[PDB]
UniProtKB/Swiss-Prot annotation, chain B:
Cysteine pairs bridged by disulfides in the record: none
Keyword field: Ion transport, Sodium, Sodium transport, Transport
GO biological process: proton motive force-driven plasma membrane ATP synthesis; sodium ion transport
Induction: By increasing intracellular Na(+) concentration.
Family annotation (Pfam families): ATP-synt_ab, ATP-synt_ab_N, ATP-synt_VA_C
Family the UniProt entry places it in: Belongs to the ATPase alpha/beta chains family.
UniProt name for this protein: V-type sodium ATPase subunit B
GO molecular function per UniProt: ATP binding; proton-transporting ATP synthase activity, rotational mechanism
Coiled-coil region list: none
Domain of life: Bacteria
Curated annotation (Swiss-Prot), chain C:
Amino acids binding ATP: G233, P234, F235, G236, A237, G238, K239, T240
GO molecular function: ATP binding; proton-transporting ATP synthase activity, rotational mechanism; proton-transporting ATPase activity, rotational mechanism; sodium-transporting ATPase activity, rotational mechanism
Gene3D superfamilies documented for this protein: 2.40.30.20, 2.40.50.100, Bovine Mitochondrial F1-atpase, Atp Synthase Beta Chain, Chain D, domain 3, P-loop containing nucleotide triphosphate hydrolases
Name under which the protein is recorded: V-type sodium ATPase catalytic subunit A
InterPro entries: ATP-synt_VA_C (IPR055190), ATP-synth_a_Xtn (IPR031686), ATP_synth_asu-like_sf (IPR023366), ATPase_a/bsu_AS (IPR020003), ATPase_F1/V1/A1_a/bsu_N (IPR004100), ATPase_F1/V1/A1_a/bsu_N_sf (IPR036121), ATPase_F1/V1/A1_a/bsu_nucl-bd (IPR000194), ATPase_F1/V1_b/a_C (IPR024034)
Keywords: ATP-binding, Ion transport, Nucleotide-binding, Sodium, Sodium transport, Translocase, Transport
Gene for this chain: ntpA
Ion transport as UniProt keyword: yes
UniProt induction comment: By increasing intracellular Na(+) concentration.
Amino acid sequence: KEYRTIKEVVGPLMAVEKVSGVKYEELIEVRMQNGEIRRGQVLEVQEDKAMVQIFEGTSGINYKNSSVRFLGHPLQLGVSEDMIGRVFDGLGRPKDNGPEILPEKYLDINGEVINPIARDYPDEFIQTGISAIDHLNTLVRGQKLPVFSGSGLPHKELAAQIARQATVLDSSDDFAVVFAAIGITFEEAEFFMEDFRQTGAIDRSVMFMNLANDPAIERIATPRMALTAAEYLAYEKGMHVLVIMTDMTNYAEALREISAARREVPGRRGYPGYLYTNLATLFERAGRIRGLKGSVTQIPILTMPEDDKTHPIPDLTGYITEGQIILTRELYKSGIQPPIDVLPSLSRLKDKGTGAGKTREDHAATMNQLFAAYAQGKQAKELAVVLGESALSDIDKIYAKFAERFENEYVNQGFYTNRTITETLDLGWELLAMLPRTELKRIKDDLLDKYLP
Amino acid sequence: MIKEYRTIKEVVGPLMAVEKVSGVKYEELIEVRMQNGEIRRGQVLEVQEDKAMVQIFEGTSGINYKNSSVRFLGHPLQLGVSEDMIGRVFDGLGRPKDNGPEILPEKYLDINGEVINPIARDYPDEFIQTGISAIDHLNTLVRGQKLPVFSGSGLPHKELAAQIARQATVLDSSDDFAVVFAAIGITFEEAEFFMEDFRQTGAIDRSVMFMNLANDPAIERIATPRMALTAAEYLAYEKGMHVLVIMTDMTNYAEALREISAARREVPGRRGYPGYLYTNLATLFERAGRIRGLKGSVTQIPILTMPEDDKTHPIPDLTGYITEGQIILTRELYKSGIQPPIDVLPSLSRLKDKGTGAGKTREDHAATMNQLFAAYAQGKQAKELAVVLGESALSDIDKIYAKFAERFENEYVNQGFYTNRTITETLDLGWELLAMLPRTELKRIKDDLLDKYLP
Amino acid sequence: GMQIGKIIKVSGPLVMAENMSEASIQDMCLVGDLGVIGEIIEMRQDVASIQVYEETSGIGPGEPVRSTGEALSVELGPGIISQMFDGIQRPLDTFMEVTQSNFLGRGVQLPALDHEKQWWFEATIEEGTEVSAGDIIGYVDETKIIQHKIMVPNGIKGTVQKIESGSFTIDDPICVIETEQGLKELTMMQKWPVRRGRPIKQKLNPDVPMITGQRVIDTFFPVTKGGAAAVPGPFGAGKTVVQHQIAKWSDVDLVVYVGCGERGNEMTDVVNEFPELIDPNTGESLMERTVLIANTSNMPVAAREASIYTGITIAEYFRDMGYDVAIMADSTSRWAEALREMSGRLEEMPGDEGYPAYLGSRLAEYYERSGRVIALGSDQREGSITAISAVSPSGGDISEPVTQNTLRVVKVFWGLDSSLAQKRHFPSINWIQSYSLYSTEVGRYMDQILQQDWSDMVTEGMRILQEEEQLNEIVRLVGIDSLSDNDRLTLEVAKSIREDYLQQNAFDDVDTFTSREKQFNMLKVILTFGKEARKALSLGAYFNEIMEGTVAVRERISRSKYIPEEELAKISSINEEIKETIQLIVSE
Ligand SMILES: Nc1ncnc2c1ncn2[C@@H]1O[C@H](COP(=O)(O)OP(=O)(O)NP(=O)(O)O)[C@@H](O)[C@H]1O
Ligand SMILES: [Mg+2]
């Protein structure tokens, strides 16, 4: 049953009249006069009318001569283990000139909420290979830990490096990366594709690539398709899955465009009032489930407009995620790779993945001691540059030197260098050795003896 | 004139639409007789053709429109007044909540009241000694005035109002005030504070109280101050009493107005408050004063909390455009331990000129008031400079003013909630502080006053 | 028979259905072929506007709607303690077993309580007694510590004709009352509409301080049993940790924790950890006094509002038995935002910042349900509800409608600070901006119950912290060296207050809780160092020398937070070591 009754077209939205039996969120197909097919979703259904959003937009559609078909089910992803190694576009269509996926089953891309009773709490270490993360802001299996960045900052290189190096020490060959690109430039897409292909990371990955030049309502579907593939691999195939999504500020833009087309009253800073809830339906899909071996870990990546952390996109993301990794322009100017500022960074669940049996027994103590010493030394630098070298005390000058070496040699490891957790902790002890023993108050003394030369 | 219809067409929040009616009047009181036996009161907001829009005081939860009916009672909302109201506690609609015997009314009065003819007014001019120096000297209260307290959440406006009610006296009038208290959306603890204070002082036996609390329906707040003021004008102008009306919190009143305004989908004014907020408030606050030839009076002290401590918010802004001054409390003075935390600089009384001076307070009243204001304003500016740039930046003369402003706040304004100063003690303390400054700085005060009173 | 409506519109959680002419505002409905749970919120002729507490994907016009004739309610009876419910009181563990799924489906109705479980009912009321609402007819030992009292339901009056002790399910009749309408049977279970406050005899002033074990709260910004406290703060500042701490250690009888639009893992953390936190006095775990209401951020939005009223109604039920209850709402901002979303769907005229015009009165009505009360019943027993509410303002800016409306009605404000959190100062309570209007009265309670001058210790400590604020501005003017020896001592004492008393690690085994008397000893020691050091300085002693001769004793002060509760003498002995050390220094 095909309807020739399209009434009007407003941006990506379309109104269909004289419909019957249509459901909220039902998948639709528009058969255009040129014969191409555009898929869409029912946003609102009343009486004999239905309101739909078209993922590819309505440009070039002659509605009087195009027909609409309602398909009787929500938008789904055909999932299969064969998706590993494949590159798809924002709507889940092959992008690598490879064969069409033969799905094991089709899954509603909205997913379902995990019963809190059935949840397992995030546990066990994920080695990113990046000292500033692994040591001070440890990523744990099942956590949501985002990167807050800015335009011109190298979050692109950081995302690729984590995809390339992330691993679990506990298990072998059960680790998979799902990478969702949202509104990224062609050059950014080029960079991610070559990096995954040249290192072989593609052979344990699934990629969903939405580009800036692509229709923007595709972005609504893109992260939901990535998370549906991840949940399949984790919960039905038992894999440890890491989902990396960039750039979520481009996701919010798509939501704002839909909101505008619907003539909804805008919320704070022109973003929809339901922005928190919408983002929660993505980020809360992370976790572990009791009795299942797999896991879904999420690293959303976003740029803070005007570097303002109080902007609705970083602010609401921080109100959902379990910590955050902050990149700054000051560290980037100094050449620090990655330019992670550990002072506003945090991982809330880190203690569940550290210590004896997971990393090493000295992990927590040296984390607290390095952090304390670095804050004190950054404050010492702040006095020395502003008030001159002489004003700073002798003990303070040590801390200033420490802070500089911490940035230049500990945080700054390079976007193409992988550090094991042992290398990171040993490097941490080499930096603490700059400080006098009378200053290592946070570290127990038998640990001090054992691990200090 | 009673009519009953089972023609409810819409039930949406606090509002109901009734159709196929005739003989219905604007502001007529109505009853909704619900399908389950409940009876809920309301008012006609608008009538056109065969339709009438009504507001329900207790909300519309549990109403089935089809099997309920609306009875139009043939008169507006009234208060059954009687001298027996004294010493009794009523809810927001004038129904007793103290388990006492129901009142046998002398008469029934439309709670909207009527405007006092401007040519029948007597000008308020009898000094009320509150015992609070920042009020009596700088922002003088006179009998028949409308003088609100502007406060904020967490600030001690209830203590200030209780102190005023407890200490207020006209020097040549031995009658105690009758107190009419209107609680509007306040918490139990706020209302209990006033209840306990009134019982301790015995004022409860000369009080009438209309209690709408935060657990009561919000639309009832619209009637509560009209019930109180109708009771007040009855006791004052028909029974000859001097009535002190304390109403809190007027911000809760304004917020109830905005709920109705929003439900009606009216054209929103500033911050969503209806464009008629000024007028609506004026119909309450102008119900104060004295009438030539009648012995009683109505003095109003409304209390409101300023949203975000912002005096330019519509609620304080429009109230200030209506009332005869305002007493402003501030967080910065409260944190410094000043009790009451009255900031005199943005406070005002518009009736102080003809209520003060020789024969009323004393001949030095207005001159020392104006000098203290000028010296406090200069000293506060001096202290603001010292914080921004250090004490050394301040000139020697401005060091005197900065210390003056400290002693003014710590000894003059900061008197305590249980301290009752006579106007003579207040004025004498004003001169002790003015003595800190050189005589050459006292431009507001003429030489005869300086020679006579200045130490 | 019963009228069947017909859906005419579906838009997210808003459904409109025609042919509903026989239904009432606030009736619950089974919506669509699936029969998902919804609530009638407004009606224009026969067309009802329904908000749905479940996902509406796959639902469309033409499907049936069926009113239940009842408003949103909870089941109140044995089997409610130690459970985790969703926002409309469905038991999440039974949900998992019945549907055989790890995920949340829809259209399945599950009774809140176990109606097949046998409980032992102990009858305590004599036959022939005249009873009314709130009267206790018997009890069930739901836990060893907590007696579940069986109360005559509101609206029931008469004389007891038959009552029998025995083992019954919550459906069995355990008592028979003779009423004017006739003979009435009573079970152990009663239903109550969540949006209506449970009636009481009268409210009382909440004046007994709660012991949270959190030093900054109990000492400087105390909440009382029956009081209300707001904890607004930016993301990561510590709102949830503060609430979990109060849930763990507070000296109330029962705790109701409402996860309102927050993270699933945090609910999972409570059900995992609380059964392992065992009270040493009674041998019972924290889960034996706890009720969990969970509606996460990605759960149905309208069910956030339901979770709030479900939680408070359960609290009121146990309050009516004569218990002290704490209810945590994390976070009320999510409830408010749900109201804002539905208000936009209904095309209502907005109030402040898009929120419905009735936001302020809804918030105020919620907190008026907390408080200390005389419950209904001849014995006039007393119970209380203490309300602790997180608020989550955008960008940490407390000048927004949810925070502002909340501070109008609550008497305690714990303002969490971004700078403190980033400095790892936890709890991140801004001690300059926070306040408790219970401080004075609590001070008198504490003085009398400790037989010590506690109120003056609290005052002096806050004075020192306030002088630290002024002195920091003066250091800002001319630097630390210009300051006098007494000023720099004040900075050191305030530094000890901040680091050795205010800062408290919720994740440390000892530091996570500090008893009332250990708090007294810790603050006395800290202030004693201040008292003795100034006396030295007046006697000619030198601040730099006083610091260099008190390293070890000040070290003891910094570790008194880790001293075990059975060893408090080790803390109180510090004072005389302080005296002796400083006396010897001035001699030298
Ligand atoms: N009392 C505390 N002791 C130690 N660490 C704390 C404490 N409170 C907070 N933290 C730290 O701060 C982090 C955030 O705490 P949390 O209670 O989750 O903040 P929140 O305000 O509820 N965040 P959000 O839900 O996003 O608004 C924790 O993971 C801890 O690392
Ligand atoms: Mg939280």
